[PDB]
UniProtKB/Swiss-Prot annotation, chain A:
Domain Myosin motor: 72-714
Residues binding ATP: G165, E166, S167, G168, A169, G170, K171, T172
Species name: Mus musculus (Mouse)
Modification N6,N6,N6-trimethyllysine, positions: K116
Recorded name of the encoding gene: Myh6
Biological function: Muscle contraction.
Myosin N-terminal SH3-like domain sequence ranges: 29-68
Name the record gives this protein: Myosin-6
From Swiss-Prot, chain B:
Subcellular location: Cytoplasm, Cytoskeleton
Post-translational modification: Oxidation of Met-40 and Met-43 by MICALs (MICAL1, MICAL2 or MICAL3) to form methionine sulfoxide promotes actin filament depolymerization. MICAL1 and MICAL2 produce the (R)-S-oxide form. The (R)-S-oxide form is reverted by MSRB1 and MSRB2, which promotes actin repolymerization. Monomethylation at Lys-80 (K86me1) regulates actin-myosin interaction and actomyosin-dependent processes. Demethylation by ALKBH4 is required for maintaining actomyosin dynamics supporting normal cleavage furrow ingression during cytokinesis and cell migration.
Boundaries of the shown chain within the full protein: 7 to 191 of 377
Protein name: Actin, alpha cardiac muscle 1
Source taxon at top rank: Eukaryota
Function: Actins are highly conserved proteins that are involved in various types of cell motility and are ubiquitously expressed in all eukaryotic cells.
Subunit annotation: Polymerization of globular actin (G-actin) leads to a structural filament (F-actin) in the form of a two-stranded helix. Each actin can bind to 4 others.
Length: 714, 185
């Protein structure tokens, strides 16, 4: 009835009731259709004797009863009697096979990349979701965009869309589709404008990753602002915590942000003539750490895209030559050289080639810069006194200066984009579109992975709190008296060692301050404070033949193993205020604009924690709506999705945590009439006072609640 | 599965794997404890240092040998030294290797009883064995007949062997060795 109005896409949105009725009545068994593991499928159906193409006999306490054939295609795995990994896995597998890329997961909105053009979004024939609710219409992200619209118009409270970002595709197309939809419903457009200046962000905040080649290395919080009544207004972009540690140090088999090699592809010899810079990447230590180039992308055409971006951007000739000069200076910093003065201690420079280069570039003096690098001044009450500097201290300061310059330039460019993309009446409300990396579990995890997983722990706790208050509200609504320990925070608040003032980060800062501290002393301190005294902190099981870890954290997405080698040098961030004062006087007006606005204690972890606190503070004032874009397969061939990839992702994406919590229900929530009908073979009071346990149900105001493992009996 | 050889001695631990040509780890059989105050807050003070780590920090430590005259007279320190030898020097798991300990002749029975009890309980070795130092010295010399004079850090002993037969009534054990010469010097 309400499905045949979507045309050629309705089959993808809601299958016709004919094949549905023939499929919802399959005769199968309860005790010969279970789930057993595998090495290439990791989960299979079979008939303990079990065979589906290969015989395996396993313990009788590891098999998962397969979902009943009643719910074998439901787009909402929150109502299943069997909430386990293979259940939802094959649920999604089937729903994608019989093409339906859209699904609901308790509160998430899982979308799968189809890789095949579909009219399921265009034209508006499918966009009829206006006025429609999630609980009635098919499970489309358009329903969620519309729900956020409705909530803004009826509640005057901002809304937020948290889309999973480490997936290479699916996320970007979904962002395009949701901004298009928001332009459509509440109608040189905001979509055009937003996608115009994107090459800037692509070149500045994306780098070659071990498990990617175009990786969002920051947080993009696109705010689409709406008028007083719900009319589209301007849209500003806001950036959050950026992995600035890469600007100097890159692991082996990775490289920093694209812009460096984009410039160094010798595409515009004008630039490589202006910045006194050659083209060989192995001459600059700040870029030649890992690999200089990947074969999966060109640099010249992307350089042209970024040039055209600066042109469509409000940048002039100076606001572009200055940026190129700053990047050239960031490269020239990498190979300045200092030596301990003969016979006492002091770091002094030997050769000033890159010194003069960078001094001319940023618009400073060379002798003044060298002196301010080797002799930083400080204000003692009312007087200034020179402070001594060793070689390693000079290098740390140089790195800190490079990182500060890069982040300042990034933020200024984002402000310029906000300016050129904003002209509108004073508006009230907006919708939050949050792009950010997700959880990571690599073969070799390090400081950056720890920071990213910490941020994702925070976001996941946010989602858990939202879902907890939702379920608690719904229980107070149906009069169902049932109270439980907070499903929101009390899960990760103990995996928040990383922030409490004795955990890993505080210990790392302490070790950054302490004399002669090394990695071994850092490991010793970690062990003395946590090994045995905490349950989430565990010693890794290091097997010879695999990379050596040093400790293991029990995250929500599994137990990750970290290798702390080098965290000390990576956490130090001593800013040299003398050189910053030199910057504030430069001739290159972009540099002075950057550093326009009675210190040696700065660490990357501290700035990161403060930025994360600010981001969570912003999010905690709005209403969230989460989306889980998935890459189904790696060979790009549509239709068939590999099971281990999608299983790992379903772990890291955050859906499995929601499943694990709703399993503590009462996941199955039905009214009276449906059970009165489908199980009348003999309202619900007498129908269930006859048989099972008396706690598996709690009736209230035409609502029955069933725990996971009861409809597998009916 | 390979086996471990752990010639203890009273002045030097020599450990390794059965089949090599020389011990893989050779360090002093010593345990040091700090005697002075300790002021730098956060320096990560260890309770005790073993092996040759206690030898480089010896300026601030008080050193103790847990073996006096071939006899183990401090079983906690000896357990520390064995734990070090297995986990930090050889870097193995004692649960996967038979261990061949060594002992001097004519020393109390409780010594070997405690050795084997320590091994089997607090290390869970699959099997063990306690040899006599002079017999092994004769193995290494490539002979089956001779009177071997072993003289280490704690005890000097002769063991006469003939055609692979020991003469236990002619074993003579003397109790001056390297350490008494060090003290006399």
């Amino acid at each position: 009835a309400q499905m045949a109005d979507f045309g050629a896409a309705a089959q993808y949105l809601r299958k016709s009731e004919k094949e549905r009725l023939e499929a919802q009545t399959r005769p199968f068994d309860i005790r010969t259709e279970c789930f057993v593991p595998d090495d290439k499928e990791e989960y299979v159906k079979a008939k303990a004797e079990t065979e589906n193409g290969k015989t395996v006999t396993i313990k009788e306490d590891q098999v998962m009863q397969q979902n009943p054939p009643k719910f074998d295609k439901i787009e909402d795995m929150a109502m299943l009697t069997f909430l386990h990994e293979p259940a939802v896995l094959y649920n999604l597998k089937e729903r994608y096979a019989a093409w339906m890329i859209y699904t609901y997961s308790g509160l998430f909105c899982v979308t799968v990349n189809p890789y095949k053009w579909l009219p399921v979004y265009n034209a508006e024939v499918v966009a009829a979701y206006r006025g429609k609710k999630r609980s009635e219409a098919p499970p489309h992200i358009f329903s969620i965009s519309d729900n956020a619209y409705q909530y803004m118009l009826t509640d005057r409270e901002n809304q937020s869309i948290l889309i999973t970002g480490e997936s290479g595709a699916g996320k970007t197309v979904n962002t395009k589709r949701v901004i298009q939809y928001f332009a459509s419903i509440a109608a040189g457009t905001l979509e055009d404008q937003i996608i115009q200046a994107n090459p800037a962000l692509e070149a500045f905040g994306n780098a070659k990753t071990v498990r990617n080649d175009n990786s969002s290395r920051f947080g993009k919080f696109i705010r689409i602002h709406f008028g007083a009544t719900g009319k589209l207004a301007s849209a500003d972009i806001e950036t959050y915590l950026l992995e600035k540690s890469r600007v100097i140090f890159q692991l082996k088999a990775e490289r920093n942000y694209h812009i460096f090699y984009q410039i160094l592809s010798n595409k515009k010899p004008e630039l490589l003539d202006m910045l006194l810079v050659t083209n060989n990447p192995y001459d600059y230590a700040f870029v030649s750490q890992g690999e200089v180039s990947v074969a999966s992308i060109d640099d010249s055409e992307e350089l042209l895209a970024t040039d055209s971006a600066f042109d469509v951007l409000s940048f002039t000739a100076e606001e572009k030559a200055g940026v190129y000069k700053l990047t050239g200076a960031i490269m020239h910093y990498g190979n300045m050289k200092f030596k301990q003065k003969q016979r006492e201690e002091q770091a002094e420079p030997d050769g000033t080639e890159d010194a003069d280069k960078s001094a001319y570039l940023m618009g400073l003096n060379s002798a003044d810069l060298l002196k301010g690098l080797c002799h930083p001044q400080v204000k003692v009450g009312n007087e200034y006194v020179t402070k001594g500097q060793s070689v390693q201290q000079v290098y740390y300061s140089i790195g800190a200066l490079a990182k500060s310059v890069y982040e300042k330039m990034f933020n200024w460019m984002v402000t310029r984009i906000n300016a050129t993309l904003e002209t509108k009446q004073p508006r009230q409300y907006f919708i939050g579109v949050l792009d950010i990396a997700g959880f990571e579990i690599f073969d070799f995890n390090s400081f950056e992975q720890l920071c990213i997983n910490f941020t994702n722990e925070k976001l996941q706790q946010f989602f858990n709190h939202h879902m907890f208050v939702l379920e608690q509200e719904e229980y107070k609504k149906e009069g169902i008296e049932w109270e439980f320990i907070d499903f929101g925070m009390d899960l990760q608040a103990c995996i928040d060692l990383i922030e409490k003032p004795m955990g890993i980060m505080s210990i790392l800062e302490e070790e950054c301050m302490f004399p002669k501290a090394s990695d071994m002393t850092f490991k010793a301190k970690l062990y003395d404070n946590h090994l045995g005294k905490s349950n989430n902190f565990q010693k890794p099981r290091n097997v010879k033949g695999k990379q050596e870890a040093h400790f293991s954290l029990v995250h929500y997405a599994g137990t990750v193993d970290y290798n702390i080698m080098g965290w000390l040098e990576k956490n130090k961030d001593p800013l040299n205020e003398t050189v910053v004062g030199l910057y504030q006087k430069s001739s290159l007006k972009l540099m002075a604009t950057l550093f326009s606005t009675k210190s040696s204690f700065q660490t990357v972890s501290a700035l990161h924690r403060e930025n994360l606190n600010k981001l969570m503070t912003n999010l905690k004032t709005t209403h969230p709506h989460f989306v889980r874009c998935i890459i189904p397969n790696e060979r790009k061939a549509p239709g068939v999705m590999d099971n281990p990839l999608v299983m790992h992702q379903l772990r890291c994406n955050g859906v499995l945590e929601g499943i694990r919590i709703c399993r503590k229900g009462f996941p199955n929530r039905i009214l009276y009439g449906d059970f009165r009908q489908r199980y009348r073979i003999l309202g619900a009071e007498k129908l269930l006072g006859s048989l099972i346990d008396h706690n598996q149900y709690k009736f209230g105001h035409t609502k029955v609640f069933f725990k996971a493992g009861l409809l597998g009996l009916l | 599965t390979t086996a471990l050889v752990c010639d203890n001695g009273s002045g030097l631990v020599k450990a390794g794997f059965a089949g090599d040509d020389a011990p893989r780890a050779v360090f002093p059989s010593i345990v040091g404890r700090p005697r002075h105050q300790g002021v730098m807050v956060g320096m990560g003070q260890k309770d005790s240092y073993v092996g040759d780590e206690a030898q480089s920090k010896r300026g601030i430590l008080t050193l103790k040998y847990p073996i006096e005259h071939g006899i183990i007279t401090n079983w906690d320190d000896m357990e520390k030294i064995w734990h070090h030898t297995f986990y930090n020097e050889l870097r193995v798991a004692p649960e996967e290797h038979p261990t061949l300990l060594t002992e001097a002749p004519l020393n109390p029975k409780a010594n070997r009883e405690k050795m084997t009890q320590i091994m089997f309980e607090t290390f869970n070795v699959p099997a063990m064995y306690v040899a006599i130092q002079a017999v092994l010295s004769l193995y290494a010399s490539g002979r089956t007949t001779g009177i071997v004079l072993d003289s280490g850090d704690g005890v000097t002993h002769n063991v006469p062997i003939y055609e692979g037969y020991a003469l236990p009534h002619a074993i003579m054990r003397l109790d001056l060795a390297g350490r008494d010469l060090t003290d006399y010097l």
